[PDB]
Amino acid sequence: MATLKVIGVGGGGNNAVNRMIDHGMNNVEFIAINTDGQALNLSKAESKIQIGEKLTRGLGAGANPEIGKKAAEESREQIEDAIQGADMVFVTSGMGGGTGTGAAPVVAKIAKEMGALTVGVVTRPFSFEGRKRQTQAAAGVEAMKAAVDTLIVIPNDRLLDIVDKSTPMMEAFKEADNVLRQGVQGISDLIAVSGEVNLDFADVKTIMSNQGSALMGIGVSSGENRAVEAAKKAISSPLLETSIVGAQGVLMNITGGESLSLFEAQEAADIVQDAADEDVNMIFGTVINPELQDEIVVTVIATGF
Ligand SMILES: Nc1nc2c(ncn2[C@@H]2O[C@H](COP(=O)(O)OP(=O)(O)O)[C@@H](O)[C@H]2O)c(=O)[nH]1
Ligand SMILES: COc1ccc(F)c(C(N)=O)c1F
Ligand SMILES: [K+]
């Protein structure tokens, strides 16, 4: 079976890895990469890599992305050894600081050279962090795009659209974490489960390899318009820089119980096709889970923008 690894690079990335481990994911390996040895000592990841100790003496990169980049380059063999064997790597990092900005594209490059299908899931900083952080972050996003197979960007300003004046900051961060964690879980499920119309890791590669921007979404619904609703939730994305609009390739899977109808599978597909507003090249899958009663789940991976 295909081996999935999630790598957190820098403070925000390792935060996301810690919160995902807390949440619980059972068939994914986690790797924590950081300059900051204090944060790395608190990581819940089974594999930890301290990079750049000679450069920083165990401190972070101090907002200097060139130090992050050098620290990763100098630890290339340790990063290779930790990746070796993965079929797919997700690299998550917060752009705009020194370690994520500089080291995450090096890690992603190493993963793609090690043979892994490589997906980046990165944040852009809040506008309140100022224009220099935003410009540094943009350069990291560009570098990440050059290094990955596909890239999901989460502008942190979008979190301000989903909170009220009291929502705890940590609850907002968990919402952003969901993008990665549900994208990972959806792939894990595809690999693990045999479908009635069966998709497998080669289909993931076809949809994701060397594609650029991506969307990864899941929607769950019940009741009379469940397929349309689940499809709409899978592609909605209030947190995403890349919406579904313009997608030219899509992997879509529908999971339901024995009641899953052909008609509602077409409805779901049509929602995705119409929201793309393009002629979508679809890879369509279906899973019948007789455990499920009235629940349906639509998973979408969209690329080709
Ligand atoms: N959404 C989210 N953003 C984060 C988190 N931690 C940091 N950030 C963002 O990521 C950017 C860089 O922070 P950090 O990863 O700590 O910097 P680095 O360790 O030096 O690479 C910050 O400017 C914030 O915009 C997090 O837990 N969640
Ligand atoms: C989330 O996508 C998934 C999940 C579980 C599956 F069995 C399949 C499949 N049709 O083989 C799929 F495409
Ligand atoms: K499968």
Author numbering: 11 to 315
From the primary publication:
The FtsZ ring orchestrates the assembly of the divisomal machinery in most bacteria. FtsZ filaments form by head to tail self-association of FtsZ monomers; this is followed by hydrolysis of FtsZ-bound guanosine triphosphate (GTP) that triggers monomer dissociation. Cooperative assembly of single-stranded FtsZ filaments is made possible by FtsZ monomers switching between a low and a high association affinity state during the FtsZ filament assembly. In relaxed unassembled FtsZ monomers from several species, a side cleft between the N-terminal GTP-binding and the C-terminal subdomains is closed, whereas this cleft opens in tense FtsZ monomers from S. aureus (SaFtsZ) forming crystal filaments, providing a binding site for allosteric modulators of FtsZ assembly. Binding of small molecules to the cleft between the N-terminal guanosine triphosphate (GTP)-binding and the C-terminal subdomains allosterically impairs the FtsZ function, eventually inhibiting bacterial division.
To confirm the proposed interaction of the inhibitors identified in our fluorescence screening, as a validation of the ligand-binding assay, we were able to determine the crystal structures of the SaFtsZ folded core (residues 12–316)34 in complex with inhibitors 18, 20, and DFMBA to 1.55–1.70 Å resolution. Omit electron density maps around the compounds clearly prove that the three molecules bind into the interdomain cleft, as PC190723,15,25 TXA6101, and TXA70747 (chemical structures in Chart S1). The protein interactions with the superimposable benzamide rings of 18, 20, DFMBA, PC190723, and TXA6101 are conserved. Nevertheless, these interactions appear insufficient for strong binding, as suggested by the 66% occupancy of DFMBA, compatible with its low affinity, while that of 18 and 20 is 100%. On the other hand, the halogenated phenyl moieties of 18 and 20 bind deep into the pocket with their benzene rings connecting to T309 and I311. This last residue adopts the same conformation in all examined complexes, while T309 acts as a gate presenting two different conformations, closed and open. The first is observed with DFMBA, the smaller bound molecule not reaching T309, and with TXA6101. In this case, the hydroxyl group of the T309 side chain points to the solvent, while the methyl group lies next to G196, thus closing the central region of the binding site (purple).
